Amino acid sequence: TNWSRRYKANLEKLASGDVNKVAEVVRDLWRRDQERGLSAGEKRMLAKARQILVGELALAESTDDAKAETILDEVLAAA
């Protein structure tokens, strides 16, 4: 039930959408993989956490690029 509490806690972190919490899941499972080794299920969750994490990074980059693009357009237009 310790394992289950932990598993559910991580699910809720992943469901949160909060990239900092997702980051915790990745770090915890990765460390656990190095130290104890992960079960098949934990490997799956680690793979998902990583996917969510990479997706958030790609989103944030796309967002910065879109903003920078609109700003540069306004500068060129004003000139």
Q: Which two tokens stand for residue 70?
A: 């609109």
What whole-number distance in Å separates Cα of residue 73 and Cα of residue 63?
Answer: 15
Residue 22, judged by CB atoms within 10 A of its CB (0-12, 13-18, 19+), counts as buried
Domain that holds residue 10: 1-79
What is the domain count for the chain? Answer: 1
Closest CA to 9 of 30, 37, 28, 31: 28
For residue 49, give every residue at least 6 positions away whose Cβ sits within 8 Å of its Cβ, in sequence order, or none: 10, 14, 22, 25, 26, 29
CATH for 27:
1.20.58.1290
Determination technique for this entry: X-ray
C-alpha separations of 18 from 56, 61, 62 in Å: 9, 16, 18
Q: Is residue 29 a contact partner of residue 46, using CB atoms and an 8 Å limit?
A: yes
C-alpha separations of 5 from 10, 38, 46, 67, 78 in Å: 9, 16, 16, 41, 58
What whole-number distance in Å separates Cα of residue 77 and Cα of residue 79?
Answer: 5
- How many Å from the N-terminal Cα to the C-terminal Cα in the chain? 65
What whole-number distance in Å separates Cα of residue 48 and Cα of residue 77?
Answer: 43
